[PDB]
Amino acid sequence: RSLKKGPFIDLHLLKKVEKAVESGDKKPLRTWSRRSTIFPNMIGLTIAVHNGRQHVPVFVTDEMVGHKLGEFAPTRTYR
Amino acid sequence: QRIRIRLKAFDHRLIDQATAEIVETAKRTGAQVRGPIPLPTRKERFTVLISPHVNKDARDQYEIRTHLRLVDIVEPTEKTVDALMRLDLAAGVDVQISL
């Protein structure tokens, strides 16, 4: 998928993950950064990942590490 | 040593007519002149859609023939160097001077 020379993460979301650890668990973290790889320092947080219209809150688990935030936010409605 | 001139022009009856001037000016002012060597013509081809919308099979095909001429003057005589320097060549002909 991506070259082994550094996984990607948005600085605005990375600083939001840093602010949430020290200040303690808050309300769902409203972010549009779907292109970021999940790091171990995220497990237990509630991240609100955009789908195009609404922010989908996804509880970060240990198995979710390595995967992208946009995988847990379906973009197209089908019924 | 040896002076190498490379000529490039899109028109053929313009390149060999400007080459005829360079060869004649050099052989008259006493120098050993090799060529006009006719190097291969690079034919750049372009196929464009002729309709402003749809109609795929209808097309206009054009080319850009880049003619080449190589003239090698063996004797770098001052009488030949200055004569070739003050030569009014055609504007649409590129001259590449190799030492």
Partner: protein
């Protein structure tokens, strides 16, 4: 002096040199059998040496550039016959009959716009 003849078929161009003595064939510094892996290609270069007799009468030094197997093989056939008339000129009559003097002007036709190939038109649909 060497007896020369140029022969061409398709994009192949063959140069033929004739010198009397033996039945040797040298193609691009290689043997006749070593260059052509098909015997059908070997017999076409032998064809000009059937009507005009040769078993060990004259040698041939040949070089061919471009094309393919039958392209090269066909070009050499045209060169031998051109080098043969260079040597005699009375052989013309025998070489016209066999049709080896004729340059095969059949070239691969250009790809045309709107067509899948040179002539192959894409599948038509009514509805």
């Amino acid at each position: 002096n060497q007896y020369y003849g140029t022969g061409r078929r398709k994009s192949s161009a063959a140069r033929v040199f004739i010198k009397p003595g033996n039945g040797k064939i040298v193609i691009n510094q290689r043997s006749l059998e070593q260059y052509f892996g098909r015997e059908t290609a070997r017999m076409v270069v032998r064809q000009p040496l059937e009507l005009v007799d040769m078993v060990e009468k004259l040698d041939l030094y040949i070089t061919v550039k471009g094309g393919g197997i039958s392209g090269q093989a066909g070009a050499i056939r045209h060169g031998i016959t051109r080098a043969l008339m260079e040597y005699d000129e009375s052989l013309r009559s025998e070489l016209r009959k066999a049709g080896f003097v004729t340059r095969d002007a059949r070239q691969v036709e250009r790809k045309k716009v709107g067509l899948r190939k040179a002539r192959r038109r894409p599948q038509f649909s009514k509805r």
